[PDB]
Amino acid sequence: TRFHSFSFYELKNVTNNFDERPISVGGNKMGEGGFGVVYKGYVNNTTVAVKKLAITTEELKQQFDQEIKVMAKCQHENLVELLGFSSDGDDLCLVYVYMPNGSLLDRLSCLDGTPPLSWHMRCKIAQGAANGINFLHENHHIHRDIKSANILLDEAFTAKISDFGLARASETVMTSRIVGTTAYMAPEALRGEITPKSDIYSFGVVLLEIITGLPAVDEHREPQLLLDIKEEIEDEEKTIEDYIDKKMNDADSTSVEAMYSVASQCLHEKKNKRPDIKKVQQLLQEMTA
Numbered sequence: 001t002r003f004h005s006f007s008f009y010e011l012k013n014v015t016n017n018f019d020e021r022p023i024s025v026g027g028n029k030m031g032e033g034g035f036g037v038v039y040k041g042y043v044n045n046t047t048v049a050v051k052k053l054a055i056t057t058e059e060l061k062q063q064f065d066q067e068i069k070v071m072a073k074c075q076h077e078n079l080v081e082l083l084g085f086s087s088d089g090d091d092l093c094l095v096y097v098y099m100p101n102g103s104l105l106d107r108l109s110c111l112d113g114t115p116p117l118s119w120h121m122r123c124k125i126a127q128g129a130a131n132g133i134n135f136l137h138e139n140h141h142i143h144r145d146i147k148s149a150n151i152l153l154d155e156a157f158t159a160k161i162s163d164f165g166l167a168r169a170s171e172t173v174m175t176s177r178i179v180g181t182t183a184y185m186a187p188e189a190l191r192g193e194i195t196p197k198s199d200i201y202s203f204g205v206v207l208l209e210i211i212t213g214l215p216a217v218d219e220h221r222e223p224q225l226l227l228d229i230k231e232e233i234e235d236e237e238k239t240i241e242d243y244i245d246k247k248m249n250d251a252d253s254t255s256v257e258a259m260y261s262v263a264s265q266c267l268h269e270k271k272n273k274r275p276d277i278k279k280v281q282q283l284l285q286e287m288t289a
């Protein structure tokens with residue numbers, strides 16, 4: 001698949017000169033951290049998300065080329081759709097289909113007054129995100145940064161996996177440049193190993209965030225790291241019912257326990273004991289069915 005080459009000045013013009021101001025006051029900024037800032041824009045009769053990239057300038061160009069490579073090979077309903085790019089101007093830009101419901105992290109934290117996600121919507125999001133990871137693993141790609149901030153939500157709250165800049169083709173390797181988000185990383189990924197089993201572990205943390213509505217890491221909380229609740233529950237001090245997000249009215253114990261069981265299996269500290277993505281996908285389908 002081939003993409004449209006956008007002019008930097010067209011992207012600069014539709015995003016109000018890449019405004020740092022947010023949604024309310026009159027700017028276009030939609031979020032940052034994923035090695036760039038995402039801005040809202042309107043191009044060729046469509047609402048778009050324009051990611052202006054902003055380690056080394058060469059490493060940032062490597063991730064720009066990697067994102068296009070992965071997106072050229074990988075088209076799926078549970079991956080964000082790349083509409084084009086821009087290399088001509090000062091800053092590297094990636095253009096996507098606009099995701100009106102932001103990220104799963106934003107929606108789990110009810111950022112900007114949005115209503116809490118229902119258990120019914122959370123199940124669809126978990127299944128959709130697992131279908132997106134399955135498609136990546138089937139095409140021998142390792143995401144390397146699976147987290148709720150990288151699961152975007154469209155007009156129908158369909159889960160769309162994003163950020164393929166750090167993605168690696170497999171088609172267990174070792175690396176000197178350890179990348180990803182600490183609170184979601186498998187022990188072997190924190191040591192430099194590159195394997196699709198690390199994406200399964202990170203997805204297990206995403207499933208706990210979905211059940212609990214709690215962020216993967218919170219400086220003002222005990223445990224500070226969400227993955228530690230797996231041990232508090234296993235060493236029967238608590239149960240998953242004590243951790244269910246109170247901001248839901250439709251969560252039943254049976255399906256929550258079925259999602260928690262998938263998460264627990266994903267979070268096995270030994271990479272070879274974790275289920276593969278097809279098994280995770282099967283278990284999430286049986287939970288609903």
Ligand SMILES: O=c1[nH]c(N2CCOCC2)nc(N[C@@H]2CCCNC2)c1-c1nc2ccccc2s1
Pocket residue numbers: 023030031032034038048049051080096097098099100101102103106149152162163
């Ligand atoms: O299209 C988008 N809309 C919004 N909304 C729209 C509604 O108002 C709030 C902002 N947020 C986005 N991402 C950020 C990511 C960081 C955390 N917060 C959300 C995207 C995309 N972000 C990306 C990122 C990579 C690839 C494609 C896309 S599309």
